Amino acid sequence: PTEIKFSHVVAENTPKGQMALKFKQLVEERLPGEYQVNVFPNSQLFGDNNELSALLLNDVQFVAPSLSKFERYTKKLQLFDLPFLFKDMDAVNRFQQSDAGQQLLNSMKRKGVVGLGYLHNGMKQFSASSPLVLPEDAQGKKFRIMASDVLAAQFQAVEAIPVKKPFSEVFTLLQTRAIDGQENTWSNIYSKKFYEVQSNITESNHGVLDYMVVTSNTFWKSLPADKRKVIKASLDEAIAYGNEIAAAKVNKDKQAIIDSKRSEVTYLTPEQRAAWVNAMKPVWAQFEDKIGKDLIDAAVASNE
Numbered sequence: 001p002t003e004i005k006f007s008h009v010v011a012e013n014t015p016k017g018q019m020a021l022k023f024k025q026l027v028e029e030r031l032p033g034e035y036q037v038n039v040f041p042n043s044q045l046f047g048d049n050n051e052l053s054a055l056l057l058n059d060v061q062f063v064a065p066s067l068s069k070f071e072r073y074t075k076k077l078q079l080f081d082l083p084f085l086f087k088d089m090d091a092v093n094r095f096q097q098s099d100a101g102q103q104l105l106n107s108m109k110r111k112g113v114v115g116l117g118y119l120h121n122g123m124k125q126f127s128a129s130s131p132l133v134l135p136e137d138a139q140g141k142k143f144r145i146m147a148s149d150v151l152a153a154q155f156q157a158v159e160a161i162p163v164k165k166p167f168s169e170v171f172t173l174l175q176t177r178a179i180d181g182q183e184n185t186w187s188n189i190y191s192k193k194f195y196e197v198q199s200n201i202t203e204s205n206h207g208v209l210d211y212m213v214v215t216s217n218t219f220w221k222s223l224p225a226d227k228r229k230v231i232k233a234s235l236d237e238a239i240a241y242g243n244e245i246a247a248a249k250v251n252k253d254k255q256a257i258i259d260s261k262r263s264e265v266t267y268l269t270p271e272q273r274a275a276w277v278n279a280m281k282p283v284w285a286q287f288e289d290k291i292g293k294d295l296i297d298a299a300v301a302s303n304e
């Protein structure tokens with residue numbers, strides 16, 4: 001059988017982890033003995049910094065990075081890092097499924113990267129070893145971020161110190177107190193046990209963590225059309241599965257964290273939320289020329 005490799009950086013019991021495993025199941029059911037899919041979770045094969053290079057080198061055939069991690073290939077996907085751009089996951093999905101959103105799947109083709117679909121995780125929440133109620137509380141704290149200039153600007157706007165690090169290192173950096181805080185979805189905070197060493201989480205919903213499932217032109221073109229159709233259908237169905245898992249994990253993992261008693265969740269008043277928005281919104285003007293103001297206008301419009 002022709003081997004297909006799918007590599008990602010998350011734990012198995014997560015929306016992306018389950019997506020990849022479902023994709024394996026469906027492909028192997030439909031094309032038995034023709035294609036086998038080997039899934040490599042937890043950065044076992046490639047991690048944040050080298051996965052896209054590996055993809056284009058055809059050392060791996062599918063990856064699904066955070067939309068934050070594509071700056072080397074397009075400046076447009078930085079849109080998804082803008083603070084308080086999307087109110088909630090309904091707006092995210094409306095944007096992603098619109099013409100404007102769908103066009104972004106093709107934003108990197110001229111560089112060899114084929115966009116196959118969006119996959120959800122969830123809204124991001126701040127955590128630290130001290131309460132984060134107003135933006136002033138972030139002053140002087142070190143936060144790990146995904147490798148994104150927008151996210152660096154986000155934390156610089158509140159006089160915090162952002163450090164770009166691969167996802168596989170975050171637990172250890174929190175454990176050793178090399179950083180004070182981070183931002184992530186409930187699913188990652190829970191599945192990677194960040195909550196065990198973060199006494200405070202704020203339900204800030206201040207950005208989105210979603211993915212684009214991608215492959216290389218090299219691999220995609222190499223498939224016979226009829227097999228590609230089956231593989232694409234299998235991928236799409238796996239994505240829908242992953243999205244259902246993503247939605248479920250928001251509530252389930254938030255609850256599990258609260259039940260553990262290891263972390264105290266803070267909820268923001270409208271005026272507290274407004275203070276974060278006002279502190280961080282200026283980041284957008286920094287990036288708007290490269291992202292595209294019209295693209296930003298489309299994203300804002302998805303909130304209606």
Ligand SMILES: [Cl-]
Pocket residue numbers: 009010011014187188191192
């Ligand atoms: Cl994870």
Ligand SMILES: [Cl-]
Pocket residue numbers: 009043046047048049166167168169
């Ligand atoms: Cl990693």
Ligand SMILES: [Cl-]
Pocket residue numbers: 096116117118
């Ligand atoms: Cl999609």
